[PDB]
């Protein structure tokens, strides 16, 4: 039960979270960036606008990425329930 091990926990987990959430919000970014640029150059600025495209993109994302993302969790979750009798010591 070293604080070192306890650190290794977070080191892994937070990287897992990186793996999951990374693509989605990136596509969100790129979307709002591009449309928001088009909000200039014949300005035409309202408010929400680019929101609606952002629902398309994320929706596509789970389609394209999908299963292997799951696999990630499926792996590590198991590994947890793997080492549990070694976590005591």
């Amino acid at each position: 039960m070293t604080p070192e091990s306890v650190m290794m926990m977070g080191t892994e987990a937070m990287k897992v979270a990186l793996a999951l959430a990374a693509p989605l919000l990136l596509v969100a970014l790129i979307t709002g960036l591009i449309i928001s640029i088009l909000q200039a150059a014949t300005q035409i600025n309202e408010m929400t606008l680019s929101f609606i495209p952002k629902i398309v993109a994320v929706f596509i994302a789970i389609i394209v990425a999908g299963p292997w993302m799951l696999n990630l969790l499926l792996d590590y979750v198991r590994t947890l329930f793997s080492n549990l009798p070694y976590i005591i010591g």
């Binding site: 989605l24 952002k54 799951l70 969790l73 198991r78 329930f81 005591i88």
Partner: protein, 203 residues
């Protein structure tokens, strides 16, 4: 001696179940549902059912050894609380030490101002209980933290997705319940729970 009798009847069984197992079990499950929202599973019934059963399986060898040790000469009802106590505690003790952190024993042996400590029964009755229980608590909360992490992960995720989309006013902790649900179900890990609490309990 009806005073002493019914007096013992009042609290006694709770003590008896403290003596063994099943504490870490319950504490664990009760720490499940705090992730995954509401009571959900019916604490009145199910949890105590599982939690009892597992104990039966686990202590079972020691148990039948007891039925031979106590109940079998208890055919005569031979001697009430004489070597039923000794023979009773021997597996109790050895198993208990087997589960007992050995630093604790240094602590309570120190504060107890003990004499020669040689036999496990040279570590007296009263000395075992507090340490052993504290141990069980320790491992219990250890596992307890081992559980939660993936769920927190999922929640940070969803939250981040919503914030990214401009979802600011949604009740995310309500929406996240089904996904926690599946990502527990999909993985079959519900076994690995009771494989873990089975193996890591004895070790």
């Amino acid at each position: 001696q009806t005073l002493v009798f019914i007096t013992s009847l009042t609290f006694l069984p709770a003590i008896l179940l403290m003596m063994t197992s099943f504490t870490r079990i319950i504490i664990v499950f009760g720490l499940l549902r705090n992730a995954l929202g509401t009571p959900s599973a019916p604490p009145n019934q199910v949890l105590l059912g599982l939690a009892l059963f597992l104990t039966f399986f686990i202590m079972s060898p020691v148990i039948d050894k007891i039925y031979v040790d106590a109940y079998q000469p208890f055919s005569e009802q031979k001697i009430s609380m004489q070597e039923a106590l000794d023979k009773g505690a021997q597996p109790l003790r050895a198993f208990m030490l087997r589960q007992t952190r050995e630093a604790d024993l240094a602590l309570f042996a120190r504060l107890a101002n003990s004499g020669p400590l040689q036999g496990p029964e040279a570590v007296p009755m009263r000395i075992l209980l507090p340490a052993y229980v504290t141990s069980e608590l320790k491992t219990a909360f250890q596992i307890g933290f081992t559980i939660f992490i993936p769920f927190l992960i999922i929640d940070l995720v969803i939250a981040s997705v919503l914030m990214a989309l401009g979802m600011m006013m949604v009740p995310p902790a309500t929406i996240a319940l089904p996904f926690k649900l599946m990502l527990f179900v999909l993985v079959d890990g519900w076994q690995l729970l009771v494989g873990s609490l089975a193996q890591s309990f004895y070790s």
